Design an enzyme around this catalytic site. Structure first.
Site, PDB file in Angstrom:
ATOM      1  N   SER A 241       1.555   2.855  -6.756  1.00 21.26           N
ATOM      2  CA  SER A 241       0.321   3.653  -6.756  1.00 21.26           C
ATOM      3  C   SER A 241       0.572   5.017  -7.420  1.00 21.26           C
ATOM      4  O   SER A 241       0.803   5.064  -8.645  1.00 21.26           O
ATOM      5  CB  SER A 241      -0.262   3.742  -5.336  1.00 21.26           C
ATOM      6  OG  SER A 241      -1.635   4.116  -5.329  1.00 21.26           O
TER       7      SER A 241
ATOM      8  N   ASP B 179       1.053  -1.543  -9.084  1.00 14.90           N
ATOM      9  CA  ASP B 179      -0.354  -1.136  -8.936  1.00 14.90           C
ATOM     10  C   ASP B 179      -0.482   0.389  -9.173  1.00 14.90           C
ATOM     11  O   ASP B 179      -0.897   1.129  -8.267  1.00 14.90           O
ATOM     12  CB  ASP B 179      -0.872  -1.492  -7.508  1.00 14.90           C
ATOM     13  CG  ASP B 179      -2.203  -2.205  -7.513  1.00 14.90           C
ATOM     14  OD1 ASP B 179      -2.614  -2.666  -8.581  1.00 14.90           O
ATOM     15  OD2 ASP B 179      -2.782  -2.391  -6.422  1.00 14.90           O
TER      16      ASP B 179
ATOM     17  N   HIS C 163      -4.213  -3.652  -2.800  1.00 15.07           N
ATOM     18  CA  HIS C 163      -3.355  -2.510  -3.082  1.00 15.07           C
ATOM     19  C   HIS C 163      -2.176  -2.394  -2.137  1.00 15.07           C
ATOM     20  O   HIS C 163      -1.073  -2.089  -2.566  1.00 15.07           O
ATOM     21  CB  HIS C 163      -4.192  -1.196  -3.034  1.00 15.07           C
ATOM     22  CG  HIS C 163      -3.543  -0.043  -3.733  1.00 15.07           C
ATOM     23  ND1 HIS C 163      -2.996  -0.178  -4.995  1.00 15.07           N
ATOM     24  CD2 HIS C 163      -3.418   1.247  -3.338  1.00 15.07           C
ATOM     25  CE1 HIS C 163      -2.526   1.011  -5.323  1.00 15.07           C
ATOM     26  NE2 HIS C 163      -2.774   1.903  -4.368  1.00 15.07           N
TER      27      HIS C 163
HETATM   28 CL   LIG Z   1      -7.409  -3.039  -2.839  1.00 10.24          CL
END
Ligand SMILES: [Cl-]
Ligand SMILES: Cc1ccc(N)cc1-c1ccccc1Cl
Ligand SMILES: [Ca+2]
Length: 371
Positions: free
Chosen positions: A219, A242, A297
């Site tokens: 992230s 991600d 996520h």
């Molecule tokens: Cl998500």
């Protein structure tokens, strides 16, 4: 349960803080271990992390006390303070956590990498993007273990662009500084750990394969990958899990000569983010992208293993895919990429097909249409 590593090595774990200040390095180390009969590693080791988590979730700080009640004794399968496995130089991964996270929350990744023969230094960032972190105000405070806590910073809309970019830049500096710390320990620098732990750092002397360095992160940590590679050529490749691309300066995109692998969840990604990832592309550069079908996520973080299926799906900690299946794909595909761009003489090329998204639970490239 957080899964055990799939590789042949037993996994050890310890914490490293050097120096003791808010400008020093703080990391959790996962490493191949000599022994496999130590106590398991405490997953979230202080009440203040739970307070920080509840502030990041937007709840009562007292909701943190309930999280502590439920999760405060949870462990992760790594041998706490185990001796380092001798007789081998290990490649090094520096790992960057996401927003609201801290150094301990990506042990499923860190343990799996360690079980395949990596040392993994999971940094704790002091940019106020962690839910909580701590440090010591001076040498006296460090001696008596009088901790100063630093909590997640919430931003006003007008602060977003500027502060996220200042934080990703500090995050990259903290990655380079963590690399220099490990490299100096490898090359024998005497280092007094600010934490009084029964793991002698003298073990890490002549234990790093010094050319075989990568940066991985989830992230905000995936933006940290890209910033880090652009400013520190000691890192030979990067894997962005991600990635949340918003923190990156416009200057960074044409400045990443190293191989870069995007592993994405299906449900997180959006056009503005994919467009930014595609700005990292140019024909002379090694780029790869895969999407895990049915994933969310949080599939990359340990929270995906912390609850049952129903509560898991409700809290968006789990997707339609099984969490063990998803992390196995992400970790195996990462190993093949690291073998290729670090020049490892292992058997990780058995997963080369996954770098291409060739699996029934993989999408090649992305599901997101940007045309
Ligand atoms: Cl998500
Ligand atoms: C309950 C929860 C919801 C959302 C996110 N992101 C994390 C958590 C959490 C916090 C501490 C320990 C375990 C979990 Cl699952
Ligand atoms: Ca640099």
């Amino acid at each position: 349960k957080i899964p055990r590593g799939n590789g042949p090595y037993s996994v050890g774990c310890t914490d490293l803080m050097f120096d003791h200040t808010n400008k020093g390095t703080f990391l959790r180390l996962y490493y191949p271990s000599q022994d496999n009969d130590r106590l398991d590693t405490l997953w979230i080791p202080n009440k203040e992390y739970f307070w920080g988590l509840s502030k990041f979730l937007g709840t009562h700080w007292l909701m943190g006390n309930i999280l502590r009640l439920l999760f405060g004794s949870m462990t992760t399968p790594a041998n706490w303070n185990s001796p380092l496995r001798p007789g081998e130089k290990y490649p090094l991964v520096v790992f960057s956590h996401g927003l609201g996270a801290f150094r301990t929350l990506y042990s499923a990744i860190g343990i799996d990498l360690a079980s395949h023969g990596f040392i993994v230094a999971a940094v704790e960032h002091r940019d106020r993007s962690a839910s909580a972190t701590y440090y010591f105000k001076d040498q006296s405070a460090a001696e008596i273990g009088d901790k100063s806590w630093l909590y997640l910073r919430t931003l006003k809309q007008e602060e977003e662009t500027h502060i996220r970019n200042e934080q990703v830049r500090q995050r990259a500096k903290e990655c380079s500084q963590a690399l220099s710390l490990i490299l100096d320990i490898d090359h024998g620098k005497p280092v007094k750990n600010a934490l009084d732990l029964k793991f002698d750092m003298e073990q890490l002397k002549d234990s790093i394969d010094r050319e075989k360095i990568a940066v991985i992160g989830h992230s905000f940590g995936g933006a940290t990958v890209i910033q880090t590679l652009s400013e520190d050529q000691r890192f030979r490749c990067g894997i962005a899990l991600d990635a949340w691309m918003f923190p990156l300066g416009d200057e960074v995109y044409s400045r990443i000569p190293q191989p870069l692998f995007f592993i994405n969840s299906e449900y997180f990604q959006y056009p503005a983010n994919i467009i930014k990832m595609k700005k990292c592309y140019s024909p002379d550069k090694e780029r790869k992208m895969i999407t895990i079908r049915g994933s969310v996520h949080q599939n990359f973080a340990d929270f995906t293993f912390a609850t049952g299926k129903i509560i898991g799906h409700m809290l968006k900690l789990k997707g339609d895919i099984d969490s063990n299946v998803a992390i196995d794909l992400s970790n195996k595909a990462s190993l093949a990429f690291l073998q290729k761009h670090l020049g490892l003489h292992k058997d990780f090329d058995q997963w080369d097909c996954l770098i291409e998204g060739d699996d029934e639970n993989l999408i090649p490239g992305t599901n997101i249409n940007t045309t």
